[PDB]
C-alpha cells in the first residue's frame, strides 16, 4: 500500500588533523537503491538496485554533486559542533542526518521529515507541519535561529512535498516489478524441550518483503504478553527479511498456544499451531 | 533524488 523514500547520511570525525568518514544511503521502502561512501574509489553516487541504473549521466553527476555538498556541509558542522559543545579535537564525533517523505496508497504526499543528530542524540528536527523546528537543547537553538533566518524550512518543504514525492513516484513506476511486489512470509514452528516439564515453541517468519510484520502469541485466544521473546526483524541478505517469536510453555500444553502472523503479502492472517 | 535545502549548523 503506502510508500516511503528515505536518505540517511553519516559523517564521522576522526581525531586530530583527521579527514572524516562519509557514508550516504538511499532507500525506497525497505530496498536500498544508492550509495556514496567516502572510502570507495569512485567518489560518485553508485547504483544499488537495478531499476536506478537506467538513469542518465545528468542524474549521476547531479546526485554526486549534492551528496558531496552534503558531506562538505557535514565537515563544517563537525568543526562547529566542537565549538558549540566545548569539545577537544582528540575525540571522534558523529553527525547523522535523515530525510524523506511518506506517501499513501494513491502515491500522494502523506508526511515528510528532516531530522539531525550529534553523537547519537536528537539535535534538531523539522516538525510535522514542515514550517518549524524542535531544538532538543541549547546549541540547537542557535542552529534553529540560523535556519529560521535562512528560510531552511521553506526549502525543505518544497523538496519534501514536491521533489521527494515526484521522484518517489518515478522510482515506483520504473521498478514496479521489484518495488510494488510483496513476498509473503514462509512460516514454520520448531519445538525444543529444555527441561522435563517445560518447552520453547518458536514461530518463524521467513523471506518476507516488506520488513513490516506482526508476530504475536496467543494462549487460548488471548494475547501472550508474558513469556514472549521477540527478536528484531533481520535481513536475509537477498532483499527479504526474517523474524521469530518464542514462548516458554509447560509440556503437554503446547496446543494452547497459537502463533499469529500478519503481513501485507498475506491473503489472510496466518495461524500456526504445533498441532 | 537527494535534496537542496541543507545548510551548515
Amino acid at each position: 500500500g503506502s510508500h516511503s523514500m528515505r536518505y540517511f547520511f553519516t559523517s564521522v570525525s576522526r581525531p586530530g588533523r583527521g579527514e572524516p568518514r562519509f557514508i550516504a544511503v538511499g532507500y525506497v521502502d525497505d530496498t536500498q537503491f544508492v550509495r556514496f561512501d567516502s572510502d570507495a574509489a569512485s567518489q560518485r553516487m553508485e547504483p544499488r538496485a537495478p531499476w536506478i541504473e537506467q538513469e542518465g549521466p545528468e542524474y549521476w553527476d547531479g546526485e554526486t554533486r549534492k551528496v558531496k555538498a552534503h558531506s562538505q556541509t557535514h565537515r563544517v558542522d563537525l568543526g562547529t559542533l566542537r565549538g558549540y559543545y566545548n569539545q577537544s579535537e582528540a575525540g571522534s564525533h558523529t553527525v547523522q542526518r535523515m530525510y524523506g517523505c511518506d506517501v499513501g496508497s494513491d502515491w500522494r504526499f502523506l508526511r515528510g521529515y528532516h531530522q539531525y543528530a550529534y553523537d547519537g542524540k536528537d539535535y534538531i528536527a523539522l516538525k510535522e507541519d514542515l514550517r518549524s523546528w524542535t531544538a532538543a537543547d541549547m546549541a540547537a537553538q542557535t542552529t534553529k535561529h540560523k535556519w529560521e533566518a535562512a528560510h531552511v524550512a521553506e526549502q525543505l518543504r518544497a523538496y519534501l512535498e514536491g521533489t521527494c514525492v515526484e521522484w518517489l513516484r518515478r522510482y515506483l513506476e520504473n521498478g514496479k516489478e521489484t518495488l510494488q511486489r510483496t513476498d509473503a512470509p514462509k512460516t514454520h514452528m520448531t519445538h525444543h524441550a529444555v527441561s522435563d516439564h517445560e518447552a520453547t515453541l518458536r514461530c518463524w517468519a521467513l523471506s518476507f518483503y516488506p520488513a513490516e510484520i506482526t508476530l504475536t502469541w496467543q494462549r487460548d485466544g488471548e494475547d501472550q504478553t508474558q513469556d514472549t521473546e521477540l527478536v528484531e526483524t533481520r535481513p536475509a541478505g537477498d532483499g527479504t527479511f526474517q523474524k521469530w517469536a518464542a514462548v516458554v510453555v509447560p509440556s503437554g500444553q503446547e496446543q494452547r498456544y497459537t502463533c499469529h502472523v500478519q503481513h501485507e503479502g498475506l491473503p489472510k492472517p496466518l495461524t500456526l499451531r504445533w498441532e | 533524488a537527494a535534496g537542496i535545502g541543507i545548510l551548515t549548523v
Partner: T-cell receptor
Amino acid sequence: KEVEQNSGPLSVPEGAIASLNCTYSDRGSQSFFWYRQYSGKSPELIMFIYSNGDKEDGRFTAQLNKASQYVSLLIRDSQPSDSATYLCAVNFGGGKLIFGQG
Amino acid sequence: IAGITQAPTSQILAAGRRMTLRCTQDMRHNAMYWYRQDLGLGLRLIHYSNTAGTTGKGEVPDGYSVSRANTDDFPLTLASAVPSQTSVYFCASSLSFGTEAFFGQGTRLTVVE
C-alpha cells in the same frame, strides 16, 4: 550543460506584457532563478522559485513546470526601467548553478 | 552592511602573465562561484565552492585556478594568459548550495598580445 532561453532582442512597447521563457536539460533541477542585468552592471535577483506553479511578486509572475522543464517570467505593466537583459539560472545539483544565454 | 566585493574592477594584461582577481564576502555564505560573461554566450560557470575548504570545476575551468582557505575569500587566478579569456568576470555567493546567488561588481578583463 544546457540552459536555453528565448531568442532576443525582444521589443515590447510601454504598458504591455513582456514574456520570457527558459528551458533546461536536467530533470532533477531543484532551484530556479530570474536575474536582471542593466548594461555594464551586475545581475540582481528578481525571483527565486522552488515549487511547481505560480509565484506572484508585484508586476512579476514566475511560473515553474518541472515536467516539461520550463521556467517563465511574465512582466506586466512594463516601465522603461525594465529594459535589461534577463537571465535564467538553474541549479544542476551542488554548486553547478548554470545560466542561460540571456 | 554585508556584501560581496570584487577587485580590481578592470585590468589589462599582457599575454602569459599571471593575475589574481579578488573576491571577498562578509555575509557568512557557504557557497561561492566565478563566472565569465561573453557576447553571445551568457554567463558561464568557471569554478565553484560549496563551503570553506572545498572546490569544484564548473563549465569552463581551464586556464583558471581557484582557492578557498576560509569562508570570506574565493580568489580566482589565471596562470597562462591567452586572449580567449578576454571577458567580464563575476564573482557570486549564496548562503548554501542551490540558494539565490548574490553577485559582485564585475571585473572587465582584456588580455592583449
